[PDB]
Design a protein around this ligand. Structure first.
Ligand SMILES: CC(C)(C)OC(=O)N1CC[C@]2(C(=O)Nc3ccccc32)[C@H]1c1cccc(-c2ccc(CO)c(S(C)(=O)=O)c2)c1
Ligand SMILES: CC(C)(C)OC(=O)N1CC[C@]2(C(=O)Nc3ccccc32)[C@H]1c1cccc(-c2ccc(CO)c(S(C)(=O)=O)c2)c1
Lengths: 249, 225
């Protein structure tokens, strides 16, 4: 790997790293998880759902703030910036969700120490048909055994997709992606020269994430139909004045 | 370098593909679409390892893959000098001639976008045949009976394609990633096609039971014969 890449990966891992620290700043701020309440309680399930949406908000903010730190993103037009973000934010979140999965306990730890099992997502009114794919995806990512550099590069590759809808300049975004693919290819050859198929398997997770983006759109439509109210930011992304405000700041 | 077993398997796949190879024009396209599905399932049965899986697994992988291979096969037949797509021997159609048959314009142009994108990649018969086999053996499909087996069935083709592209185009080290990114594209084009097929339904253009079944039985009979 060339020296300009080595600095870039260090820049990307640091930006990811700086974002992980920020939320913890926000952990006390969240709505509390209901304790001592009935699992079947419709009242309690709504508070559990409200808890997760606020966590989901903090994650969207992290991804937006990370996207501004990755080189070449802010050089694009704001209409393109959000167009890349709408499509990617959910996929970036499932990567981050997979990153926070523990196979020993089978629990996903959000923020500093907010741990939840497969049942806890079910008790927030989320269907198991939508929950189980996220856990299957989370197990598949642990088998690859990705590190901070490989995640961060895979995140940037995922952001710069010309394949997204409503992208005005696909050539420029594909040109912007190529260096991140170069860096990731060259980085995977130094780390595991023995395993040549390690890098292809990473790029096929981006294939998985597109189906996972689509099932999430099916879920969100069902949750709005089931009277589970999303915050304005999250509903704006998955239906963009609010989203301009983060990027402009 | 490729082994003689790997080289023989590639030429097995290329040989397998070559063996299978308004209202009036609409009936034509659906009649053409069935032939492609029949070519896909027949080709799928030529692929080594596809028939050692359970029918529940076989159908799950086909059902998801048929469009994605149809779109890959559509891209091959596109000619950029004319901007026309050539089906079978002598059936050539422009984007307007697709539009005149009642196919919606919002869905047509992404397919044409994909066809030009595939043209720029400049895939050959071998690379195409490997990419179709890689697409068939995808573990992220709905209704997985056994996802661990299909990942193992995919590996030989991904290894073959990786080693092939490094030999065929050693200068272009990123040739192999781009063609994997087209599988990422083909997933959104898959979910897009579901949205299209639905739109024709309400225009009083219901798909025939084979295409209705796949893009919602008859698929067992095609796999059986
Ligand atoms: C629909 C609402 C808005 C409630 O939720 C979401 O859109 N998602 C996306 C994925 C998500 C889901 O749908 N099922 C699920 C099962 C397990 C793990 C995550 C999820 C959920 C979620 C639920 C709880 C937490 C997160 C979350 C995802 C990523 C990150 C990492 O940045 C963080 S956090 C707060 O720790 O930053 C939180 C996501
Ligand atoms: C809705 C019905 C069921 C009628 O159509 C389809 O689902 N498809 C899938 C792809 C398709 C589409 O949706 N828009 C479109 C625009 C241009 C080119 C192909 C298409 C179309 C099609 C239309 C006409 C021909 C084909 C076709 C696609 C592939 C092959 C070869 O594999 C052959 S053929 C007959 O030459 O074997 C025909 C596909």
């Amino acid at each position: 790997l060339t020296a300009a890449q080595e600095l870039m990966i260090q820049q990307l891992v640091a930006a990811q790293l700086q974002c992980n620290k920020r939320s913890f700043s926000d952990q006390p701020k969240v709505t509390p998880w209901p304790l001592g309440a009935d699992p079947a309680s419709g009242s309690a399930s709504q508070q559990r759902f409200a808890h997760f949406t606020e966590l989901a908000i903090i994650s969207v903010q992290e991804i937006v703030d990370f996207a501004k730190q990755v080189p070449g993103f802010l050089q694009l037009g704001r209409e393109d910036q959000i167009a890349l973000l709408k499509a990617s934010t959910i996929e970036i979140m499932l990567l981050e969700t997979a990153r926070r999965y523990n196979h020993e306990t089978e629990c996903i730890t959000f923020l500093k120490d907010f741990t939840y099992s497969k049942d806890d997502f079910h008790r927030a009114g989320l269907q198991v048909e939508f929950i189980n794919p996220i856990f299957e995806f989370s197990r598949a990512m642990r088998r690859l055994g990705l590190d901070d550099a490989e995640y961060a590069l895979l995140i940037a590759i995922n952001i710069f997709s010309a394949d997204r809808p409503n992208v005005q300049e696909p050539g420029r975004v594909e040109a912007l992606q190529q260096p991140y693919v170069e860096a990731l290819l060259s980085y995977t050859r130094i780390k595991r020269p023995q395993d040549q198929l390690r890098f292809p398997r990473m790029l096929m997770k981006l294939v998985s994430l597109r189906t996972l983006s689509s099932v999430h759109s099916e879920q969100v439509f069902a949750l709005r139909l089931q009277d589970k109210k999303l915050p304005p930011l999250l509903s704006e992304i998955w239906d963009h004045k609010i989203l301009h405000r983060l990027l402009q700041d």
